[PDB]
Amino acid sequence: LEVNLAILGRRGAGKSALTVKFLTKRFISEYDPNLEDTYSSEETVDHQPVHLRVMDTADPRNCERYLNWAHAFLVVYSVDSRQSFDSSSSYLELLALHAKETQRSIPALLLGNKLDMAQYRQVTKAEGVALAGRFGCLFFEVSACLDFEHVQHVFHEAVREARR
Numbered sequence: 001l002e003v004n005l006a007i008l009g010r011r012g013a014g015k016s017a018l019t020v021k022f023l024t025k026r027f028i029s030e031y032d033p034n035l036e037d038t039y040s041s042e043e044t045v046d047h048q049p050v051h052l053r054v055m056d057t058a059d060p061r062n063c064e065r066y067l068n069w070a071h072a073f074l075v076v077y078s079v080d081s082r083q084s085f086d087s088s089s090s091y092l093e094l095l096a097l098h099a100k101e102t103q104r105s106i107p108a109l110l111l112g113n114k115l116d117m118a119q120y121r122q123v124t125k126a127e128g129v130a131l132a133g134r135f136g137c138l139f140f141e142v143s144a145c146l147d148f149e150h151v152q153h154v155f156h157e158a159v160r161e162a163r164r
């Protein structure tokens with residue numbers, strides 16, 4: 001089973017850090033901000049094997065490259081950046097519009113990353129919940145430089161959302 005996951009969000013939000021942590025179980029803090037690519041991994045989600053494809057985007061034009069490809073989305077902002085949070089809402093609007101225009105119904109997970117920087121929070125967890133509420137998507141706060149298991153969970157949950 002092949003599952004396409006696309007990761008969207010404003011530059012700086014930690015899209016690649018989250019991807020590399022998922023893939024490698026390590027935090028890599030400087031990763032080419034311009035590099036966009038699809039990363040392949042063999043996963044097991046609910047005792048079921050998956051060929052997972054993770055598209056780590058770097059933005060704007062030809063959004064269909066992910067809009068007509070992904071089976072689920074992660075939309076990422078940083079909890080220490082209002083700017084990032086605001087940009088996250090635009091990606092969710094795009095997902096909504098595309099679904100409306102094409103009938104393509106794809107689940108999304110809203111991610112407030114850099115939970116390790118919670119002391120400099122510009123966005124509350126309650127506000128992330130509210131934003132997810134406006135788009136009917138799931139919501140998680142995560143970090144690329146805490147443990148691996150919580151990052152694995154969100155990626156595997158996108159898989160579960162894609163299978164439902």
Ligand SMILES: Nc1nc2c(ncn2[C@@H]2O[C@H](COP(=O)(O)OP(=O)(O)O)[C@@H](O)[C@H]2O)c(=O)[nH]1
Pocket residue numbers: 009010011012013014015016017018028029030031032033113114115116117142143144145
């Ligand atoms: N403190 C902290 N910094 C992070 C985290 N994730 C990414 N970063 C940093 O945020 C910046 C952008 O990360 P990057 O993965 O390039 O984000 P991208 O542009 O969305 O792909 C870099 O300085 C990363 O080191 C995180 O979870 N916690």
Ligand SMILES: [Mg+2]
Pocket residue numbers: 015016017031032033034035056057058
């Ligand atoms: Mg990146």
Ligand SMILES: [Mg+2]
Pocket residue numbers: 037038
């Ligand atoms: Mg490639």
